[PDB]
Design a protein around this nucleic acid. Structure first.
Ligand SMILES: [K+]
Ligand SMILES: [K+]
Ligand SMILES: [K+]
Ligand SMILES: [K+]
Ligand SMILES: [K+]
Ligand SMILES: [K+]
Ligand SMILES: [K+]
Ligand SMILES: [K+]
Ligand SMILES: [K+]
Ligand SMILES: [K+]
Ligand SMILES: [K+]
Ligand SMILES: [K+]
Ligand SMILES: [K+]
Ligand SMILES: [K+]
Ligand SMILES: [K+]
Ligand SMILES: [K+]
Ligand SMILES: [Mg+2]
Ligand SMILES: [Mg+2]
Ligand SMILES: [Mg+2]
Ligand SMILES: [Mg+2]
Ligand SMILES: [Mg+2]
Ligand SMILES: [Mg+2]
Ligand SMILES: [Mg+2]
Ligand SMILES: [Mg+2]
Ligand SMILES: [Mg+2]
Ligand SMILES: [Mg+2]
Ligand SMILES: [Mg+2]
Ligand SMILES: [Mg+2]
Ligand SMILES: [Mg+2]
Ligand SMILES: [Mg+2]
Ligand SMILES: [Mg+2]
Ligand SMILES: [Mg+2]
Ligand SMILES: [Mg+2]
Ligand SMILES: [Mg+2]
Ligand SMILES: [Mg+2]
Ligand SMILES: [Mg+2]
Ligand SMILES: [Mg+2]
Ligand SMILES: [Mg+2]
Ligand SMILES: [Mg+2]
Ligand SMILES: [Mg+2]
Ligand SMILES: [Mg+2]
Ligand SMILES: [Mg+2]
Ligand SMILES: [Mg+2]
Ligand SMILES: [Mg+2]
Ligand SMILES: [Mg+2]
Ligand SMILES: [Mg+2]
Ligand SMILES: [Mg+2]
Ligand SMILES: [Mg+2]
Ligand SMILES: [Mg+2]
Ligand SMILES: [Mg+2]
Ligand SMILES: [Mg+2]
Ligand SMILES: [Mg+2]
Ligand SMILES: [Mg+2]
Lengths: 129, 139, 121
RNA sequence: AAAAUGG
RNA sequence: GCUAGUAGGUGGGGUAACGGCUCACCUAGGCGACGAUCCCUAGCUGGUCUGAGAGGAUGACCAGCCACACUGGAACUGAGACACGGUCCAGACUCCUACGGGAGGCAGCAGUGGGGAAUAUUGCACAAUGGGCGCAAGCCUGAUGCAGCCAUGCCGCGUGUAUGAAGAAGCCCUUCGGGUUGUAAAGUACUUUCAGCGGGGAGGAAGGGAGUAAAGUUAAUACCUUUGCUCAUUGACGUUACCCGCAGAAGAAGCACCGGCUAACUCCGUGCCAGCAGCCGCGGUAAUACGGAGGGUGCAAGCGUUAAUCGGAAUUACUGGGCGUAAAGCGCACGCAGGCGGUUUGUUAAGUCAGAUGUGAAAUCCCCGGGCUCAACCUGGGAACUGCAUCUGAUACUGGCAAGCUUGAGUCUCGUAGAGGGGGGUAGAAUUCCAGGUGUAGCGGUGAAAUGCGUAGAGAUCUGGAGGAAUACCGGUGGCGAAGGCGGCCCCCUGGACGAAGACUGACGCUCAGGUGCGAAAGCGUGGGGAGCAAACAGGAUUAGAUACCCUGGUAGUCCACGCCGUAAACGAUGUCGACUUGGAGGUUGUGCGCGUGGCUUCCGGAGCUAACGCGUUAAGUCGACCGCCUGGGGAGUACGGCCGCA
RNA sequence: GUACACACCGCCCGUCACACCAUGGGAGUGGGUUGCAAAAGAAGUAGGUAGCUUAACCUUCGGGAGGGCGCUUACCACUUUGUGAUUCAUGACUGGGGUGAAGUCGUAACAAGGUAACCGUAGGGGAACCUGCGGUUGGAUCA
């Protein structure tokens, strides 16, 4: 059954980028929206929009540069089967800093860089290059 | 044979104890021959084995290596044919055996005429004879 | 394999056996020659390779190869054997150490003398 | 219809 | 599976102290698939080696801890021992004896024998550090400081340095022109580390012992104590380091390797011989692969070999691998434990995260330095010790608790299709047999025959009857079922699936070791049945033979009931569940209004994936959850043991 | 189509004969370790006390208290017996496996391999195998 919704979101993006889809819609959640904000601020997606009330849906507008998807690789790190937590000094660097790592800290979801500045470790949600 | 290994060790020690003691296994007979400067000498050694070395042994006369030789001359034929299908095995040789000069051993003569036996097969014939000669033809 | 399966049953290594069991983790072992003889190599080689059955101090009886040209080894000769199998000889997994114990060095050897226990000419 | 083999 | 002081309680006793520690009594507990019990192996650690790391391997020396001291056992004394150089008892050994009885314990140091591939001198000194005793002096110390042996390792240095064409001889090779050794050597000019000889010379030495002085103390300028002061005095190493002087290149290079891997090639000898070899292989008369020589390559007081560990090996893959066909998806399903789990709010702060505090011996490793002429080596400080406990915080995510929601899951209302299952009944065709009629010489069979059958009337044809088994056509890349499977028609009982439109419940889910159920054919048990077919068997052919293939016969079995077996290329050689990602042409079955919209299914194909073949929205694409399984070919899915079975 | 590549005069299977090696079974035989049920009881320590004996204290001067010795009980080492378990060694003979060498007998598979092959099961046969039943395609053919 459906057990990892975050990995599904990442798959939808990846599969959408590979299929050259303008936007990818999915069932919405607070954590999904948080990650969507981090992706948008880091310039991996164009925009996101949550619509509906009883059953909200999150639509993400994907961005393609020179006919190539901006998100070259998006992979889930921490998963239900194996959760990954890192201290502030152990925070991962994706693509030697050229990529981002979405991390859930005690002060909310943020990039690895931001978390390292705040001196906060947390759960490594995904790597986005 | 448990004491045989001990006997080896015993003979080694005995040789160290007495220079005149000489232990040597005759290869042909396959029997170990003990050499001494006297009967009493050897007797004492054997008694020592029985006690000191705790190796039970019984002395005997060394076996003699004999040989054989044809006392008569006769021309003979050796034919081997085994063909029942596909590659077979044919071979026929007419060899004359004659008593050689005592001590001259083997004096094979290739008197093949008309190249009936090809040159390549000739050495094999001789070699085969030699091996068979090494094996007993009488006893 | 999944992590959960690995927690239940961890990754398993291998025993890895020795090619020279009679040595019993020793550089060399002393032994007495029980039979010195010759044997034919397996195809595609042809020769009369010199070998000797040896009863080691540890109590194992093994076959050892007598390297070099010419040897003075007879039955009841104390020799030192080392590790080293012979490809074309089936069952010979040890080599006699030339120039040690009752084993003599190869004569008329001017190259690789240390490997045949020959003193500097 | 039968129709093996070939260090 | 394990356990009767066993698990606990109560009281008594016992210990320095808690305690089944012990005893009595009472209760019936305790432990274990988070591995008990039992078996095998083993001193543990800081560390060491290898590795980019994660790991793997290891625990010699040094330091901490534990255990043991001829073997088995016991206590005594003492602050401390159930006591290496104490006691008692027993045992095995060795020794003494007057035969009655005695004595002893190198796993302290050295040393001996034995074992082994292999591991050192029966040295010196308590000069120093530390320890026991003593007021102190001092005494004791195989601790310790040092010396001996050993290339065992590590580190530093040397064995000369410039010049030198004569491109000498001499060697090897050569196309006989020459080339190479090779500036290499001679020859010439220098230097002398080190070794050797000679002569100087630290430092490790602190203190202690004499006095002498002041102060303190005291009745006392006593004695004692303290701190100064003064005078002789203490080095095993030791012929110390080091320095200096003298003679003279003198006194000082070897080991392995040159077919590829792998840096280094020719000649000669030998001729599948002798031999070589890590692997691939090499040697049978033009061997860069054997052996020798010349020449070279690499290392160097070492160089090889062997053993051994890690690496390379992503070849157990945590980091970091696979399972359509290479090894690998359980035959299928249900399901407990376990793992994992939609969405929203609040709450808690377990995980997690942050900071702090304590601890994580020293050494080692690492960094920055200092000291030995340098280095090895020694040393100061720092770092690190990634861990653990505690306190104070953060609260997103994960977890717990509480209330929710509907989207997953489920229920109900209605209809549809189906060889889904179980039971009972029935129909038509055909085969066989039995009885009778007609009729007459063949029939049957094969590649060709023959066996066989037939004048005791076959075969053929017609009529009546008996019995068993299977259901032509429909019929289909059709349908139904978890899989195995399921096919005339009818009734009875019963399971699932799908569609339409609503309502209801509210995460009620997914996977699943062990467990349990189902599971073709053959086979097995008992009782029935037996048409046709047919293992076995028989005869006839075929053939060199023919234990076959072919022919004529034919039993078990095939069928039914009940029970057992539990396996198949049980296959899509593709585990299950969920989400996502271009198309086309069909089949089958609902449903809405020619165009839609569901279920299932067949072919083809795009991206992507794949070793390739191929797969391709029914994935072998892209991801997540859980399970099963693989780790070269044989040996072998075999042996042994266990469990199951009537076999 | 193919399991062939000095290329079908290819490749290749099993029994049998001989030699060698490892290993299973085997009347048993000899060791190690160990479970259970008992027996045993040195020394020591603790408890009791037939008897014997006694520096320190008390005393009515007699003795008393207390102690020691001996004895006795409990615990217990050596040792002993019976019966199991496990492990190792060895054993007449025997099963299968592997490696030999131009042996013997066939030709089962690879082409439609000359009866397509293979899987499970059953029966038969010197051997490879053959035959029945059901299953699979990992079979060729189609003019
Ligand atoms: K060869
Ligand atoms: K207890
Ligand atoms: K108690
Ligand atoms: K370790
Ligand atoms: K002990
Ligand atoms: K004391
Ligand atoms: K001292
Ligand atoms: K992995
Ligand atoms: K469950
Ligand atoms: K929370
Ligand atoms: K029948
Ligand atoms: K499973
Ligand atoms: K056997
Ligand atoms: K036995
Ligand atoms: K066949
Ligand atoms: K069959
Ligand atoms: Mg041990
Ligand atoms: Mg590695
Ligand atoms: Mg005491
Ligand atoms: Mg003592
Ligand atoms: Mg001692
Ligand atoms: Mg000693
Ligand atoms: Mg020795
Ligand atoms: Mg003394
Ligand atoms: Mg090279
Ligand atoms: Mg030559
Ligand atoms: Mg190695
Ligand atoms: Mg590895
Ligand atoms: Mg692999
Ligand atoms: Mg296969
Ligand atoms: Mg396979
Ligand atoms: Mg399956
Ligand atoms: Mg299931
Ligand atoms: Mg917490
Ligand atoms: Mg430390
Ligand atoms: Mg929560
Ligand atoms: Mg129905
Ligand atoms: Mg179906
Ligand atoms: Mg059946
Ligand atoms: Mg039956
Ligand atoms: Mg029939
Ligand atoms: Mg038939
Ligand atoms: Mg199976
Ligand atoms: Mg099937
Ligand atoms: Mg399978
Ligand atoms: Mg396709
Ligand atoms: Mg089996
Ligand atoms: Mg046996
Ligand atoms: Mg007693
Ligand atoms: Mg055939
Ligand atoms: Mg065939
Ligand atoms: Mg076939
Ligand atoms: Mg048959």
């Amino acid at each position: 059954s459906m057990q990892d919704p975050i990995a599904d979101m990442l798959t939808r993006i990846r599969n959408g980028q590979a299929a050259n889809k303008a936007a990818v819609t999915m069932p919405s959640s607070k954590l999904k929206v948080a990650i969507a904000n981090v992706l948008k601020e880091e310039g991996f997606i164009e925009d996101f929009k949550v619509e509906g009330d009883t059953k909200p849906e999150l639509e993400l507008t994907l961005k393609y540069f020179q006919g190539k998807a901006v998100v070259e690789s998006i992979q889930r790190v921490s998963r239900p089967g194996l959760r990954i937590y890192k201290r502030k000094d152990e925070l991962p660097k994706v693509m030697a800093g050229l990529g981002i790592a979405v991390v859930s800290t005690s002060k909310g979801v943020m990039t690895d860089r931001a978390a390292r500045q705040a001196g906060l470790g947390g759960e490594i949600i995904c790597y986005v290059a | 044979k448990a004491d045989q290994d001990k006997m080896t060790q015993a003979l080694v020690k005995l040789q160290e104890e007495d220079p005149t003691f000489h232990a040597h296994t005759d290869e042909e007979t396959g029997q170990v021959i003990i050499g001494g400067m006297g009967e009493l000498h050897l007797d004492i050694l054997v008694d020592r084995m029985k006690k000191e070395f705790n190796v039970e042994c019984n002395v005997g006369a060394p076996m003699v290596s004999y040989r054989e030789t044809f006392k008569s001359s006769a021309q003979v034929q050796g034919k081997f044919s085994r063909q029942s299908g596909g590659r077979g095995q044919y071979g026929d040789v007419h060899i004359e055996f004659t008593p050689n000069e005592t001590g001259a051993g083997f004096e094979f003569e290739n008197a093949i005429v008309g190249g009936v036996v090809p040159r390549e097969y000739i050495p094999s014939v001789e070699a085969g004879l030699k091996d068979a000669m090494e094996n007993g033809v009488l006893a | 394999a999944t992590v959960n399966q690995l927690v239940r049953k961890p990754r398993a290594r291998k025993v890895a056996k020795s090619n020279v069991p009679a040595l019993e983790a020793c550089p060399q072992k002393r032994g007495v020659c029980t039979r010195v003889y010759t044997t034919t190599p397996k195809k595609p080689n042809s020769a009369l390779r010199k070998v000797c059955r040896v009863r080691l101090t540890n109590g194992f009886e093994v076959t050892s190869y007598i390297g070099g040209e010419g040897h003075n080894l007879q039955e009841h000769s104390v020799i030192l054997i080392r590790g080293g199998r012979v490809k074309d000889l089936p069952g010979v997994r040890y080599h006699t150490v030339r120039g040690a114990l009752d084993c003599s060095g190869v004569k008329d050897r001017k190259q690789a003398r240390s490997k045949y226990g020959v003193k500097r000419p």
